[PDB]
């Protein structure tokens, strides 16, 4: 009955493609062709954070738009003060092979993962003064490529063994495991309401999970190579996925397909990080070509360039209040733009 | 700056701690260990003293080798192999007894990798005795259909080494090959001397004199 099941799957895929095509009556560009462009966005490095000595692989902003945790292959996760370029914490990691870091929305905890297959949760507001590992979540068979805090208690982690798992940091057990990816899951972003999240896997597919039910809802397959980054629109009804195909695309959750693709002819390096502005008009994309291009998310043209990085930018994140955008690169430099 | 003078003091304290930690951690010779499954990686890592990534740090003649046996990551290499650049060398183990085409493909993938265009490979050929016994039992033409020549242990080993060392194309890197039987203590001096040569070459390149 395997052949019958394969035929059913193929015809269901054809039906899904037909439905997505029928839902398309006008693209994004034809609707945003009558609005004024944002113009050239001149963005200057206001602060530069020189604390790391190895390639910075991830960074996350505090919910108060002031603190920033930065994780590098140096084996450290320095928590930064963006306004006063100070360092408030320097947490030595057990495993120096770190590929992700998260800052809890309450600010009490900092997660961290990598090639050790284990997400390490750190307690910043400890009575003893120091930062101590409150939990080490060990349930993955592959490198943990992303981890995002739902709240102080539960964290969703994306791993390199084709699985995303929702955890319970109090008891250290997988509350839910999300399966369905056919390759490494190298990116993850939780919705503003944190009731659902998307992941961008390295099989050129991005799936839409919801943590409560624990099952995938929609899959968006538009890319031609591994998806290296993903980020929700602030409305929570869209997200943009940046791939190694040197293109980042805007997907609409309700329309269930692409909206626009952000590519330029002289761009060949693959995306490493995609982030949005507070209003969602600017889509800042990090490139392996040492530059971050600021894309007019509605006009799909380069509104500016964030030049000044001597190596591939590995992470980019806009503050929750939209004041600044911070970029980390492989030259161990974290730069705050505004 | 009223009591932020205490905050700047703390920031400078942990900044000097970061600097000291980086100085201490730059003294270590990082080595990446690859090779096919059951290719003697465990045998050499358990003979040079001391689930996903297994680091075996040890000291030999004042060189702190940090050897990363990353064979436990059964996933796509391309997504995490870029974090292993700036490694001093890539130790490559090959099972001469078993499992040669896969090793050749892996060596071609890793020697022409975009991040390892300068990182030289210390190539190991373990199970020499088993290879010789198998040659005495079975011809070496089984592995290589286009192999023409004498069927002795020395010529077969030389042909295998030539096939492995012909996979590189960057003139800035060299492949150091060795013969091992796994019943030896000479699998560490070879690594040490190859690493010294790589260190002097990288120092000369950094100065621009090379």
């Amino acid at each position, epitope marked *: 009955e395997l052949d019958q099941l394969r035929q059913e799957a193929e015809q269901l895929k054809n039906q899904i493609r037909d439905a997505r095509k029928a839902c398309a009556d006008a693209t994004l560009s034809q609707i945003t062709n009558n609005i004024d462009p944002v113009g050239r966005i001149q963005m200057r490095t206001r602060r530069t954070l020189r604390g790391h000595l190895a390639k910075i692989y991830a960074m996350h902003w505090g919910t108060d738009s*002031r*603190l920033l945790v930065s994780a590098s292959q140096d084996g450290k996760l320095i928590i930064w*003060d963006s306004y*006063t370029t*100070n360092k*408030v*914490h320097a947490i030595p990691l057990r495993s120096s092979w770190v590929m992700t870091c998260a800052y809890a929305p309450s*600010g009490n905890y900092v997660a961290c993962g990598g090639l050790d297959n284990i997400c390490s949760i750190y307690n910043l*507001k400890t*009575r*003893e*003064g*120091n930062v101590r590992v409150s939990r080490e979540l060990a349930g993955h068979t592959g490198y943990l490529s992303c981890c995002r805090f739902l709240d102080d208690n539960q964290i969703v982690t994306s791993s390199g063994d084709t699985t995303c798992a929702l955890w319970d940091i109090e008891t250290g057990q997988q509350t839910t495991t999300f399966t369905g990816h056919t390759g490494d899951v190298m990116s993850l972003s939780l919705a503003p309401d944190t009731r659902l999240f998307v992941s961008g896997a390295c099989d050129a597919s991005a799936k839409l999970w919801d943590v409560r039910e624990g099952m995938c809802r929609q899959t968006f397959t538009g890319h031609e190579s591994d998806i290296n980054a993903i980020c929700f629109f602030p409305n929570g009804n869209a997200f943009a996925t940046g791939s190694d195909d040197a293109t980042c695309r805007l997907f609409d959750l309700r329309a269930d397909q692409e909206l626009m693709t952000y590519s330029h002819d002289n761009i060949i390096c693959g995306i490493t990080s995609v982030s949005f502005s507070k209003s969602g008009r600017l889509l800042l994309a990090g490139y392996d070509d040492f530059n971050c291009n600021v894309w007019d998310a509605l006009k799909a043209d380069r509104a500016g360039v964030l030049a000044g990085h001597d190596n591939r930018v590995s992470c980019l994140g806009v503050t929750d209040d939209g004041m600044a955008v911070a970029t980390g690169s492989w030259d161990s430099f974290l730069k705050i733009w505004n | 700056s*009223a*009591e*932020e*003078r*205490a*905050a700047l*003091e*703390r920031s400078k*304290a942990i900044e000097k701690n970061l600097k000291e930690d980086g100085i201490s951690a730059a003294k270590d010779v990082k080595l990446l260990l690859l090779g096919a499954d059951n290719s003697g990686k465990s045998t050499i890592v358990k003979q040079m003293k001391i689930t996903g990534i297994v680091e075996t740090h040890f000291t030999f003649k004042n060189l702190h080798f940090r050897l990363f046996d990353v064979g436990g990551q059964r996933s796509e290499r391309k997504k995490w192999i870029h974090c292993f650049e700036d490694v001093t060398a890539i130790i490559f183990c090959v099972d001469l007894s078993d499992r040669m085409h896969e090793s050749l493909m892996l060596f071609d993938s890793i020697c022409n990798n975009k991040f390892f265009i300068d990182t030289s490979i210390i190539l190991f050929l373990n199970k020499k005795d088993l290879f010789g016994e198998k040659i005495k039992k079975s011809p070496l033409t089984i592995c290589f259909p286009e192999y023409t020549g004498p069927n002795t242990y020395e010529d077969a080993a030389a042909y295998i080494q030539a096939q492995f060392e012909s996979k590189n194309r960057s003139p800035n890197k060299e492949i150091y090959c060795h013969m091992t039987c796994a019943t030896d203590t000479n699998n560490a001096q070879v690594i040490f001397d190859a690493v010294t040569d790589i260190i002097i070459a990288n120092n000369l390149r950094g100065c621009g004199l090379y």
Partner: single-chain antibody
Amino acid sequence: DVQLVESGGGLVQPGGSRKLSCSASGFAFSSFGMHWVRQAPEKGLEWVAYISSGSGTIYYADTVKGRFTISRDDPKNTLFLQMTSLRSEDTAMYYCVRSIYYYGSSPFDFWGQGTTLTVSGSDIVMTQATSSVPVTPGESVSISCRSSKSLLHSNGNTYLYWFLQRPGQSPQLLIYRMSNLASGVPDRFSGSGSGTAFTLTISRLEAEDVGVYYCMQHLEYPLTFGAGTKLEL
């Protein structure tokens, strides 16, 4: 748990010397800037000295400079306050206070127990108008404390602290930076103010909340305590 036990206090003849040691355990003493706060038998608190993390910066009061010295022993987890030429006005009960400083930190959060020591112009003048209030459980009480200078710094943070010294106990930080409630303090305690005039409001006052409330600024060393408003049952 976190424990700051100090000893070395007793009857000292005038003109003598005495060393106080503050044994610390349960926390990372190395990264904490440690203070010394004294309290005369009939007066309020009065800041004495301060040694920062890493023994970098040391401060003293006007009546302390030269006479005292503050040292710490990070490997031994002990803080020393060597005193020289102890006058008759140096009698007090010297407390040990840990005040780690970073963005969002909670300075003065834990206080030692104290050792009684029975000895035989540009500063911020912070005065509390009322020195005692009669209150009843279940009622709301507000304590005020006016400052000479504006404590609202240009960075948006006003540096006013509120401490409660229950009878027979050590002060416990209640409100730090004039609006933030310290960890472990019940939510019924609230603080407010504007630049110079500050007030702390307590809702549903309980029998365990009776004591003497002190107001403190941290804008500049030396640090001036309030007279101390005492609320009795």
